[model samples]
Target: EYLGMLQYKREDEAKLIQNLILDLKPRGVVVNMIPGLPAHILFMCVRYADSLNDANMLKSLMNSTINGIKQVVKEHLEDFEMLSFWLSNTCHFLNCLKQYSGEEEFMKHNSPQQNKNCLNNFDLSEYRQILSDVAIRIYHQFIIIMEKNIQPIIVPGMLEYESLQGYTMTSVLQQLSYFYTTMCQNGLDPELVRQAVKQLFFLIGAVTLNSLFLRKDMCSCRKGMQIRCNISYLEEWLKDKNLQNSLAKETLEPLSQAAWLLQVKKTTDSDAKEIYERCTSLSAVQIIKILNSYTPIDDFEKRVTPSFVRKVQALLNSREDSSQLMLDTKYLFQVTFPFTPSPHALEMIQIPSSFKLGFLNRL
Candidate 1:
């Protein structure tokens, strides 16, 4: 029930593709044969290209088609977005070229293609190589604008604008959701979303962890109260955004442990053992550093005694993962391009009239 609102995120990939695809087509230009880049529609055209014996008709159309595709590639001025969009389409379209062609490379994965198994015509295999190369070219530029757009919003949010604005750091959450939805509708791949979100999580963890280290004044029990309390909203917000089983949370482990370490009210040796157990992600060096440097604000809370610090280390000594250890705060998650093979069988598939493929059928 906590995240029932965000459940609106569409789970199906194909449908979202249609949403963003129609938005990208050029109205005056009827030349793009399979512009929207639907798998079913694109392959259907491939079949039509092969079945038709009109060589002259196919060649002229192909030339116009290549021109238009290249036009859109150069015309991709919308920044980081259309890169993933166009790159995805190009690769997916390249994929369509393969599975539909009966290439054994991807053919083992293609369904029982008894009839739709292989094409009946000329070699388009030459062009497939071309599209694959161009795909990375688009990818190179994709990374360019992605970060340029990312820094502005995150930087604004990154500065010390927390609950002080009551509606303050809350605004960063707004930016987070804003980017979330923006990336959502941009013909975005969900995996891509996860990576960007994870990176943001790293930034949040590092920024918060580093800030905590520098400003010990904010490290007292009250600020501990603030942190332990503050992080709950961010953590739950992430779960709702990322859903369960998010690796992004793993990235936040450092800060999560640090926040919890703050409000340890127990002064006895027993809880220090518990601290060693609970803060396993934090190393002995930092654990002692935190316990020793802790600032007790009100007279009510007592500073950890020297002996307690020793015992904490005593328990943690066997953590052979000893000294040479520190949290991986500087690490940025890397993006791995996924390998996707089309699973849909062409024989059973038909395009929905909703796309108004009258444009596709026109030529």
Candidate 2:
């Protein structure tokens, strides 16, 4: 009787498995990207099917999983949060497939004994490519949506209102909270978020230097101090968000260099030499404008000297390229997903009892 009951339970979970895939089985709250449970569970069943030495059944299983992914991803072009969630899962699931594909080339980074768990029967190379294409296409879609939303605000936040100097970073960074938090709770990984955010700061800082040219109004020391105040909020925001390494301050390089161009008190001589070395990416046009427009908000500050522009122009003439005042986003937000294949063998992955997946057997 006990054996019979065990047989009945096994059949129960086996039948229940297809529906879970059909529904895109997420077991619990979406927090950190697990990239495991749901992923490893399907492959374990794949292992069992392959153990039976049947190609046809494993093919059906793989195709159906692909089908369900298509359904979930189908009409999801409408929302940012959902796209983020899907991209997070889809990209991570691709990593798991890449790790398990029995490719000896990928297994080199193993932790001493971990590669022992790679699938023995399958070379899923084609499936890996298909999944890579699927993941990247979704991400390209996500980029379009993200760029669209930020486009309207980029001009207003970085230039029209001039918060960088005056310190209303509160509103602009507040808007970032909406985009950043929206993706997190909905299912995106922070690694993925960093890719998007690096661009936000990238575009944010570049535009300031872009406009510092057109404005006779932009050349004041106190406002230069404001640009400094402005980026620290962004800097603190990046640190507070725990994305300190996401190239956040790299965007500020141009703005900060220009900011100092105003505040440096020894404006006596190397003003040209200082600029030549200091702001390599700063536009030639920008340096000239700041020099000519150099006005002091403080009563103590001195006007820029007549020779400063001449010295800089003589040195930096050949290096003039970023004059395309509008941003070229190709380099900044390239649509490349990160590959972080874990050394944790598939068998070593644990599923919580809370996941309602208790009936699934360990590899």
Candidate 3:
């Protein structure tokens, strides 16, 4: 009776195996539709099987199936196709394993060694090149979308409309976060992906600033002359064609108004000095009027002659600390009047002990 019972159990197990293979076979092309299914089935069998040998067979089957999948990905796939297939299938496989075990066991199973095993089949050099190409495309696409759709609203509304500033900044940062997360998930180096994005902003900053200044609606000067007391307003006006074109005619080489201001310290000619004095005399409102009327310059100099270099030297010589030196330099530019110095004043001024003036020395 014991022999007969063993024979019956053997027959029953074989029939169940036949039914599982025949009934569960998927239809259509054998694409990677059921990632981790082999491993999951083995894991479940290992839990319920009566004998150690049966458990070992199931484990062997699982590893062989996984090896087959890896071979297919490495040999058949290329570029983004390879990346998508490997990452998606592998993650799905990981999830299947996690479902069989508890969370703690799952964490232990996915240790660094296992991670290395998972990636061991891939050609790393090809994968890296593909990742770099994808990263650059992704970074370029974002800037294009931002410039075409989002930047117009944000640039004009950044300081003027409180709601827009918050909304647009939040939207931009959220998109960036998604991009970063996606790069990391795909096995691409997140910082390497980020470097492509960083390069884009280097040129974009100057371009965006120039675009803002040029736009009739977004230009801060469009807010009117009364608002011009702010230094930013005057700076914008200096960049405008009205001031720049006027200065170009007087200088030996054509110079923008900003360039002329920068060259003020080096200029020795009386004509250039007179031009500098004239610029210092005008208020923001007056500068606007001069530009608006296309007014001719009878005299560039005002009654008060301010020496830009002398004042800078004096401020530097007086301040013991760098921070105070910066604050007082701003004060001289914005607040102090009659910015002119007496003859030979700059020559007599001593350089401060604390100030190094590395770049400023070029001035």
Candidate 4:
């Protein structure tokens, strides 16, 4: 009964490797491999080579691992887009290190300031909070299910099973290839490489947490969905000649104000007036962009409509508004759905559901 359940278990790693290689071959993703740099070179030497010994061979191996693996499995990578960034940056940098194997020799390469600009500027805090809360919930739910089904079957070495069986294990191999390749590449620590990596891990955590929350909010926020739909309806009104030409200050006011207040949490860093200034700048731009983008596409867009825009206006005008935060919850409830339809059944289906309410309920 569980034969197909563990179907891929009979395949070998070589077969898995074959599937991955076939996937990445088309993109021409692989480039030439270079020698390791100073810090990475040194790190590789200490870890893979002997301490104080040159890790040239290990460096080459690392380069081969990153470039070679990517070349073979880049195609299947698209299927697992959630993990794409990790794969891309990791591979690109590994490829970059391979390109500049001798970077450690240059004094300029070791400086921290030089590396600071290379890091992503996006904030991961809100996303992380959402993810953490959701993961804990789901984990607890899993525990409940497993506990109820006391005849629990412990499935071990499942991934290894994929390697043993002769199967199309491209997804599995691609995942490993991306991860190992990333680790090999991050070996280069100019100055704040450690911190950069730390932040990367932090981002991963945030993404995971946020993803979890999003998965849950899907079912819990139906009102949000209707609100979004309403917003869409209003955009359609914008297309009317009367609405388009009769632009009153009051008409634009809500959007402008909503846009303005929306920025409070983001732009303002200081607890003082700076935060307000940031909010002012953010809402101003956001509201305008919303109005501009939707008014033209009236009825075309799904998420941004007139009702939400009015709320945006209300939010912007208010000194203490939590409209956006409330919107997120409402949005989540509106968009939630059930199990993903089987891929074979729905040719157009690809992206997974963003939130799963049961995740929170079961936990």
The model with the greatest lDDT is 2
Query: What C-alpha lDDT values do all the predictions have?
Result: 0.57, 0.64, 0.31, 0.28
Error of 1 at 71 (Å): 14
Tens digits of per-residue lDDT for model 4, 321-357? 3323211211111111111111111111121122111
lDDT of 3 by residue, 1-363 (tens): 010001113223333333322222322222233332322332233323322335444444344434444444445333333333343334333443333233343434453423321221112233223433443333343334333443444333333333312353345334434444544444333333334233323222323333333443332222222122222332333354123322222221211232233223232445444444445422333222222223122243222124533433333343232221001101111111111111111112222222221112110
What is the TM-score (0 to 1) of candidate 3?
0.26
Query: Which 10 consecutive positions of candidate 3 have the poorest summed lDDT?
Result: 324-333
Task: Please identify which of the two predictions, 2 or 3, would achieve the higher lDDT against the true structure.
Answer: 2
Model 1 lDDT, full chain set: 0.57
TM-score of each: 0.60, 0.70, 0.26, 0.21
Better-scoring candidate (lDDT), 1 or 4 = 1
Better of 1 and 2 by TM-score: 2
Model 1 residue 296 CA deviation (Å) reads 2.8
- Residues 281-300 of candidate 1 have per-residue lDDT tens digits of 77677767777778877888
Best by TM-score: 2
Misplaced by over 4 Å in model 2 are: 1-37, 41-71, 104-117, 151-167, 182-190, 211-216, 262-269, 289-310, 318-324, 329-331, 334-363
Q: By descending TM-score, how would the candidates be arranged?
A: 2, 1, 3, 4
